[PDB]
């Protein structure tokens, strides 16, 4: 395995410090995959921001996702399961449990999810940050991770924060949960 090139693609067991690190609000920035299904489906996502509340005693994360797709907001919450040893996270989408490797970069205000990382025919990365806009410093780290997987930068699908439809609903939820 080529290092430093692939340094950040390397899984490590998930600790409580790591769970704390990913706690809070995240914005989905960019992704790329060799999997063709994810290429056509992720292409429809205009924005997404979500909340992670990990439960360190249960190895779960409570997710509250706010996805913008088809000119509308789609809200869903669920309990993700954490597989500490394998450095992975899992959730149910469309009936089936799906797994993602939890990965990181130099900047702690960012994180990645790795999909099908064992399979060079299907692998991909999704890129997340604490703001909907990222710096060239932050981007560089993600683009490097794509270089590791030999995925062209041209294959990246990007969000556009101005197209978000979920902010007004998140606003409504804040009102409800703080009442
Ligand atoms: C292409 N996308 C369907 C996969 C993205 C990774 N996706 C995910 C997948 C499989 C298992 C766990 C997770 S955690 C997670 C939390 C927030 C968001 Cl927005 C996405 C994910």
Contacts of 49 (CB under 8 A, 6+ apart): 25, 26, 27, 28, 66, 132, 164, 166, 170
Q: In 3D, which of 4, 24, 18 has the Cα closest to residue 85?
A: 18
Closest CA to 18 of 79, 78, 88, 76: 88
Pocket of ligand 1 (CB under 6 A): 28, 38, 42, 48, 50, 63, 65, 80, 89-91, 98-100, 113, 115, 126
- Residue 100 CA to ligand 1 center (angstroms) comes to 7
Angstrom distance (rounded) from CA 18 to CA 41: 29
Domains for the chain: give ranges and CATH numbers: 1-179 (2.40.128.20)
State the distance from the centre of ligand 1 to the C-alpha of 179, rounded, in angstroms. Answer: 30
Nearest by Cα to 126 from 167, 165, 155, 87: 155
Resolution in A: 2.2
């Amino acid at each position: 395995m080529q290092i430093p090139l692939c340094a950040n693609l390397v899984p490590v067991p998930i600790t409580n410090a790591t769970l704390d690190r990913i706690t809070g609000k995240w914005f989905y920035i960019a992704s790329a995959f060799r999997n063709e299904e994810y290429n056509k489906s992720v292409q429809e996502i205009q924005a997404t921001f979500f909340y992670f509340t990990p439960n360190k005693t249960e190895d779960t994360i409570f997710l509250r996702e706010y996805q913008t797709r088809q000119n509308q907001c789609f809200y869903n919450s669920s309990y993700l399961n954490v597989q500490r040893e394998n450095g992975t996270v899992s959730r149910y989408e469309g009936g089936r449990e799906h797994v993602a490797h939890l990965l990181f970069l130099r900047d702690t205000k960012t994180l990645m999810f790795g999909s099908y990382l064992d399979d060079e025919k299907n692998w991909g990365l999704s890129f997340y940050a604490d703001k909907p806009e990222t710096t060239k410093e932050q981007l560089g780290e993600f683009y490097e991770a794509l270089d590791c997987l030999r995925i062209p930068r041209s294959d990246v699908m990007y969000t556009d924060w101005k197209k978000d439809k979920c902010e007004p609903l998140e606003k409504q939820h804040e009102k409800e949960r703080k009442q």
